[PDB]
Enzyme design. Structure first.
Site, short mmCIF file in Angstrom:
data_model
loop_
_atom_site.label_atom_id
_atom_site.label_comp_id
_atom_site.label_asym_id
_atom_site.label_seq_id
_atom_site.Cartn_x
_atom_site.Cartn_y
_atom_site.Cartn_z
N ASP A 84 35.02 -8.50 -38.75
CA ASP A 84 35.20 -9.05 -37.39
C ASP A 84 35.89 -8.02 -36.51
O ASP A 84 37.08 -8.07 -36.22
CB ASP A 84 35.99 -10.34 -37.45
CG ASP A 84 35.96 -11.10 -36.14
OD1 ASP A 84 35.15 -10.76 -35.25
OD2 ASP A 84 36.74 -12.06 -35.97
N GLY A 175 42.17 -18.06 -28.11
CA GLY A 175 42.44 -17.25 -26.94
C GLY A 175 43.21 -15.97 -27.23
O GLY A 175 43.24 -15.07 -26.39
N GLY A 178 40.87 -11.25 -30.99
CA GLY A 178 40.56 -9.91 -30.55
C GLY A 178 41.80 -9.06 -30.32
O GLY A 178 41.69 -7.85 -30.22
#
Ligand SMILES: [Ca+2]
Length: 223
Positions: A84, A175, A178
């Protein structure tokens, strides 16, 4: 971030917000023209926002730069979230200063017990939803692979690590994906997944960046 603290404006200078009309994921600036984020954050039409604190107010240190190319890891699996990780190239180089700065890639993998800093604009509640406008921070340890695998049987690959608190209460959340996990001044993790947020015996799971340094360097050198 659940159970964290307000970082303070531009105290996490490598943190970026990915914007597609709204903030949807975090990322980390690794040099003047490249951002690393999670593959599950892939979207067309990304604007990268650097130097942010309050994502709803122009405060004076922002740089807004469109993405020119996104590269999802060749082996990303959206079902298992293995690999990922994604790279985003900026249309133009960021202007680096004390408030917008790159974070170094690791030259080793970090051990279990190392304290790290996790940051983002994600949900701050374990039950319900409350999204902050300013950047939140959490200090959390890397957990042993054995505790991580016991928490998530059959789901943890060699490209993942757990960090946080088995007691719950403190975690990254929706949220924050990343975003950076920085330990001893290096980028060691990317906020990837977890079961809910800040739940007991369900720590956060992070992409293990040290496994990807060769791919990152090679990709940047040719794109
Ligand atoms: Ca702002």
């Amino acid at each position: 971030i659940v159970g964290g603290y307000t970082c303070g404006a531009n105290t996490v200078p490598y943190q970026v917000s990915l914007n597609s009309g709204y903030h949807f994921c975090g990322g980390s600036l690794i040099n003047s023209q490249w951002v690393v984020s999670a593959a599950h954050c892939y979207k067309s039409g990304i604007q990268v926002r650097l130097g942010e604190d309050n994502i709803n107010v122009v405060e004076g240190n922002e740089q807004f730069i469109s993405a020119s190319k996104s590269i999802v890891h060749p082996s990303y699996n959206s079902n298992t979230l293995n690999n990922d990780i994604m790279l985003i190239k900026l249309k133009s180089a960021a202007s680096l200063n004390s408030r917008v700065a790159s974070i170094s890639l690791p030259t080793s993998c970090a051990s279990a017990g190392t304290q790290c800093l996790i940051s983002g604009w994600g949900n701050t509640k374990s039950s319900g939803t409350s999204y902050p406008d300013v950047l939140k921070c959490l200090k959390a340890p890397i957990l042993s692979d054995s505790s991580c695998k016991s928490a998530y049987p059959g789901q943890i690959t060699s490209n993942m690590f757990c960090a946080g608190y088995l007691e719950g209460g403190k975690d990254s959340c929706q949220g924050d994906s990343g975003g950076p996990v920085v330990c001893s001044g290096k980028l060691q993790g990317i906020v990837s997944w977890g079961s809910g947020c800040a739940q007991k015996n369900k720590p956060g799971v992070y992409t293990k960046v040290c496994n990807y340094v060769s791919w990152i360097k090679q990709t940047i050198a040719s794109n």
